[PDB]
Design a protein around this ligand. Structure first.
Ligand code: H1G
Length: 186
């Protein structure tokens, strides 16, 4: 099946807990996969304009590890619940992808999660201005604008709204698309 095939692909790239004890400032992100209309999608947030870090930017759900978290995956799930109302029974964490090093002292660990079909986002407006889906296949043939660095523009055909996706967030989206969609029969 589509979902069994995605999980099987993802497991081959799982690094597990290999980098998780290193003494960094630690953040986790959740890369949330949603199946709709017979295709996989990623769920993104737009960050509230009130936030100190990166107001108004497109981001995956996530945030800084705190003492309550049993592990890095727990960080991602806690923050996702705060931001968009995703409950733990509504997500299956499938793997941990390559972590992202930034600023010399920070390590961001990305986890891919399969999202239940009955989840409906409840954006928390103190943290998130918007929540939206992009089909995974978009990231194989994105609409690129050079700003010099590459920016993706995605227009939602439901409403005509255009979102800009860039940086670590864009890079991770492409990685997930390659992992799941490469070399597939039609
Ligand atoms: C250091 O590089 C990273 C590491 C992790 C992340 C993921 C991330 O933050 N996702 C997120 C998505 N949408 C809305 C969000 O609002 C919550 C928020 O940003 N908070 C929580 C209240 N106070 C804060 O200081 C910050 C957060 C982004 C960048």
């Amino acid at each position: 099946s589509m979902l069994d095939d995605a999980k099987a692909r993802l497991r081959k790239y799982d690094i597990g807990g290999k980098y998780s004890h290193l003494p960094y400032n630690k953040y986790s992100v959740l890369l949330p996969l949603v199946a709709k209309e017979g295709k996989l999608h990623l769920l993104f947030t737009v960050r509230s304009e009130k936030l100190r870090r990166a107001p108004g930017e497109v981001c995956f759900p996530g945030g800084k590890r705190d003492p309550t978290d049993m592990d890095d995956a727990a960080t991602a799930l806690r923050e996702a619940q705060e931001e968009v109302g995703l409950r733990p029974h509504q997500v299956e964490v499938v793997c941990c992808l390559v972590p992202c090093l930034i600023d010399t002292d920070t390590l961001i660990t990305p986890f891919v999660g399969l999202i239940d079909h009955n989840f409906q986002a409840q954006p928390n407006p103190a943290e998130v201005k918007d929540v939206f889906l992009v089909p995974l296949a978009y990231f194989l043939h994105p609409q690129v604008h050079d700003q010099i660095n590459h920016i993706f523009e995605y227009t939602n055909p439901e409403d005509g709204v255009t979102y800009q996706i860039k940086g670590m967030t864009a890079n991770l989206a492409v990685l997930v698309a390659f992992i799941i969609l490469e070399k597939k029969p039609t």
